[PDB]
Enzyme design. Structure first.
Site, PDB file in Angstrom:
ATOM      1  N   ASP A 288     -13.631 -14.817  14.340  1.00 19.41           N
ATOM      2  CA  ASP A 288     -14.369 -16.714  14.780  1.00 19.41           C
ATOM      3  C   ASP A 288     -14.104 -17.822  13.814  1.00 19.41           C
ATOM      4  O   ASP A 288     -13.530 -17.874  13.832  1.00 19.41           O
ATOM      5  CB  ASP A 288     -15.502 -16.791  15.640  1.00 19.41           C
ATOM      6  CG  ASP A 288     -17.470 -16.516  14.431  1.00 19.41           C
ATOM      7  OD1 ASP A 288     -16.453 -16.015  13.713  1.00 19.41           O
ATOM      8  OD2 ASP A 288     -18.056 -17.220  14.896  1.00 19.41           O
TER       9      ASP A 288
ATOM     10  N   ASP B  48     -19.140 -34.736   3.111  1.00 16.60           N
ATOM     11  CA  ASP B  48     -18.225 -33.523   4.417  1.00 16.60           C
ATOM     12  C   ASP B  48     -17.660 -34.516   4.790  1.00 16.60           C
ATOM     13  O   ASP B  48     -17.278 -34.228   6.023  1.00 16.60           O
ATOM     14  CB  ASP B  48     -19.507 -33.107   4.763  1.00 16.60           C
ATOM     15  CG  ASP B  48     -18.886 -32.311   6.010  1.00 16.60           C
ATOM     16  OD1 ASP B  48     -17.846 -31.519   5.538  1.00 16.60           O
ATOM     17  OD2 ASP B  48     -19.406 -31.863   6.622  1.00 16.60           O
TER      18      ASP B  48
ATOM     19  N   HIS C 212     -17.934 -31.066   9.324  1.00 15.81           N
ATOM     20  CA  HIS C 212     -18.790 -30.281   9.894  1.00 15.81           C
ATOM     21  C   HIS C 212     -20.201 -30.499  10.433  1.00 15.81           C
ATOM     22  O   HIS C 212     -20.362 -29.255  10.598  1.00 15.81           O
ATOM     23  CB  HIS C 212     -18.982 -29.330   8.688  1.00 15.81           C
ATOM     24  CG  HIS C 212     -17.864 -28.753   8.281  1.00 15.81           C
ATOM     25  ND1 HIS C 212     -16.983 -29.598   6.947  1.00 15.81           N
ATOM     26  CD2 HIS C 212     -16.454 -27.640   8.820  1.00 15.81           C
ATOM     27  CE1 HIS C 212     -15.827 -28.631   6.272  1.00 15.81           C
ATOM     28  NE2 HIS C 212     -15.884 -28.200   7.868  1.00 15.81           N
TER      29      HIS C 212
ATOM     30  N   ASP D 294       0.762  -0.920   0.184  1.00 13.59           N
ATOM     31  CA  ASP D 294       0.108  -0.003   0.306  1.00 13.59           C
ATOM     32  C   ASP D 294       1.103   1.282  -0.050  1.00 13.59           C
ATOM     33  O   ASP D 294       2.070   1.228   0.904  1.00 13.59           O
ATOM     34  CB  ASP D 294      -1.032  -0.194   1.159  1.00 13.59           C
ATOM     35  CG  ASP D 294      -2.293   1.112   1.163  1.00 13.59           C
ATOM     36  OD1 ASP D 294      -1.697   2.452   1.992  1.00 13.59           O
ATOM     37  OD2 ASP D 294      -2.514   0.843   0.762  1.00 13.59           O
TER      38      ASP D 294
ATOM     39  N   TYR E 110      -8.658 -35.778   8.784  1.00 10.45           N
ATOM     40  CA  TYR E 110      -9.930 -34.735   8.549  1.00 10.45           C
ATOM     41  C   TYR E 110     -10.868 -36.072   7.861  1.00 10.45           C
ATOM     42  O   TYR E 110     -11.740 -35.832   6.763  1.00 10.45           O
ATOM     43  CB  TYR E 110      -9.485 -34.095   7.652  1.00 10.45           C
ATOM     44  CG  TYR E 110     -10.355 -32.646   8.213  1.00 10.45           C
ATOM     45  CD1 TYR E 110     -10.517 -32.158   9.047  1.00 10.45           C
ATOM     46  CD2 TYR E 110     -11.627 -32.352   6.842  1.00 10.45           C
ATOM     47  CE1 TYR E 110     -10.936 -30.663   9.349  1.00 10.45           C
ATOM     48  CE2 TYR E 110     -11.868 -30.905   6.611  1.00 10.45           C
ATOM     49  CZ  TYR E 110     -12.189 -30.546   7.858  1.00 10.45           C
ATOM     50  OH  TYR E 110     -13.167 -29.108   8.058  1.00 10.45           O
TER      51      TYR E 110
HETATM   52  N1  LIG Z   1     -16.957 -24.166   5.942  1.00 14.66           N
HETATM   53  C1  LIG Z   1     -17.053 -25.287   6.509  1.00 14.66           C
HETATM   54  C2  LIG Z   1     -19.094 -24.039   5.564  1.00 14.66           C
HETATM   55  C3  LIG Z   1     -18.769 -23.145   4.231  1.00 14.66           C
HETATM   56  C4  LIG Z   1     -21.074 -22.988   3.837  1.00 14.66           C
HETATM   57  C5  LIG Z   1     -20.269 -23.669   1.955  1.00 14.66           C
HETATM   58  N2  LIG Z   1     -20.222 -22.366   1.369  1.00 14.66           N
HETATM   59  C6  LIG Z   1     -17.177 -26.294   5.103  1.00 14.66           C
HETATM   60  O1  LIG Z   1     -16.993 -25.770   4.280  1.00 14.66           O
HETATM   61  O2  LIG Z   1     -18.541 -27.323   4.498  1.00 14.66           O
HETATM   62 CA   LIG Z   2     -19.610 -15.826  17.090  1.00 18.04          CA
HETATM   63 CA   LIG Z   3      -3.661   3.064   1.092  1.00 17.87          CA
HETATM   64 ZN   LIG Z   4     -12.775 -26.277  10.068  1.00 16.52          ZN
END
Ligand SMILES: N[C@@H](CCCC[NH3+])C(=O)O
Ligand SMILES: [Ca+2]
Ligand SMILES: [Ca+2]
Ligand SMILES: [Zn+2]
Ligand SMILES: CC(C)[C@H](N)C(=O)O
Ligand SMILES: [Ca+2]
Ligand SMILES: [Ca+2]
Length: 316
Positions: free
Chosen positions: A138, A226, A231, A57, A157
């Site tokens: 958050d 997922d 999640h 910047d 994961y």
């Molecule tokens: N962070 C979560 C929710 C994102 C909401 C969907 N665009 C995921 O990756 O599943």
């Molecule tokens: Ca919050």
């Molecule tokens: Ca600037």
């Molecule tokens: Zn996460």
């Protein structure tokens, strides 16, 4: 870059003014030298190449609309650093002051944020599902907490270990939000989710079922979406963590709350001393019980409350 430490001023995604630590060498760069090996914020320029260019910047004033996601990624990485250092005596994500790197303006209309193994990455949202996601403290702290988990428990994961990984990120994302203490809550992502809709969020820790997530082990998801519901099943652990801190009666089981500071100490110690890459929910309960025993004693209220909370969500 090598340069002199400076203090810029900018506006974040929600329009709030804040000072940010910068580095001057021809340009003012989003490089905070005051925290460990540095906090570094990058412009991905609507592309998907990472990290992109270190944010430069001309004048050390960051009030342009394009600047806002950068301001907040940078500032909230600093707040998160400060939480881990001041509250848990942890220096950055690796405990040895690793540089914290973030990129903003990732892709076009990208409704997410993530930790990629090496750095944090934030989309701008599409302006309907999300606004730029670094606007949520958050969210920032959730993503940085994945780096902490990478270096500590290393929770895989997928399936239950993955749901623990996600819950740990929602728990510490929430505790960082409380630490900063600007209208903190037990919801995830409310500040950047659905600008057209008041009062919603992506997930709730206090009532996971408000957004269709399980609040008891008997409601766990066992399908393949997922990564096996990382999640989704996180709601079971999020609910336990909420109960440990705040108390309540859930499916008829009463939990005496012990407060946020103790919740954080118990789960930080579990994360860093007892959990492993393959831990399941039953093993998390044991880790939390051992951590609370270490800190407070085996016949303590804190141990009792951990046990009641996991009983309340069906995790034995
Ligand atoms: N962070 C979560 C929710 C994102 C909401 C969907 N665009 C995921 O990756 O599943
Ligand atoms: Ca919050
Ligand atoms: Ca600037
Ligand atoms: Zn996460
Ligand atoms: C959007 C953010 C909170 C995270 N990557 C999910 O959940
Ligand atoms: Ca909040
Ligand atoms: Ca909303």
């Amino acid at each position: 870059i090598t340069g002199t430490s400076t203090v810029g001023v900018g506006r974040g995604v929600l329009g709030d003014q804040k000072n940010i630590n910068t580095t001057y060498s021809t340009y003012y760069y989003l490089q905070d030298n005051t925290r460990g090996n540095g906090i570094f914020t990058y412009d991905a320029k609507y592309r998907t190449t990472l990290p992109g260019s270190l944010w430069a910047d001309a004048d050390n004033q960051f009030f342009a609309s394009y600047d806002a996601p950068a301001v907040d990624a940078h500032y909230y990485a600093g707040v998160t650093y400060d939480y881990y250092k001041n509250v848990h005596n942890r220096l950055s994500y690796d405990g040895n002051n690793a540089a914290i790197r973030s990129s903003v303006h990732y892709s076009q209309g990208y409704n997410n944020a993530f930790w990629n193994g090496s750095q944090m990455v934030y989309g701008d949202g599409d302006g309907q599902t999300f606004i730029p996601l670094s606007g949520g403290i958050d969210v920032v702290a959730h993503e940085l907490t994945h780096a902490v988990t990478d270096y500590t428990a290393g929770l895989i994961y997928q399936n239950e270990s993955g749901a623990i990984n996600e819950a740990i990120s929602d728990i510490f994302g929430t505790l960082v939000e409380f630490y900063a203490n600007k209208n903190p809550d037990w919801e995830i992502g409310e500040d950047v989710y659905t600008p057209g809709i008041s009062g919603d969020s992506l997930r709730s820790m206090s009532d996971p079922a408000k957004y269709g997530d399980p609040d008891h082990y008997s409601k766990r998801y066992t399908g393949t979406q997922d990564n096996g519901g990382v999640h989704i099943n996180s709601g079971i652990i999020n609910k336990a963590a909420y109960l440990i801190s705040q108390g309540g009666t859930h499916y008829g089981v009463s939990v005496v709350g012990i407060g946020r500071d103790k919740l954080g100490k118990i789960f930080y110690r579990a994360l860093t001393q007892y959990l492993t890459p393959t831990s399941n929910f039953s093993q998390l309960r044991a880790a939390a019980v051992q951590s609370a025993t270490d800190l407070y004693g085996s016949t303590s209220q804190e141990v009792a409350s951990v046990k009641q909370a996991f009983d309340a969500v069906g995790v034995k």
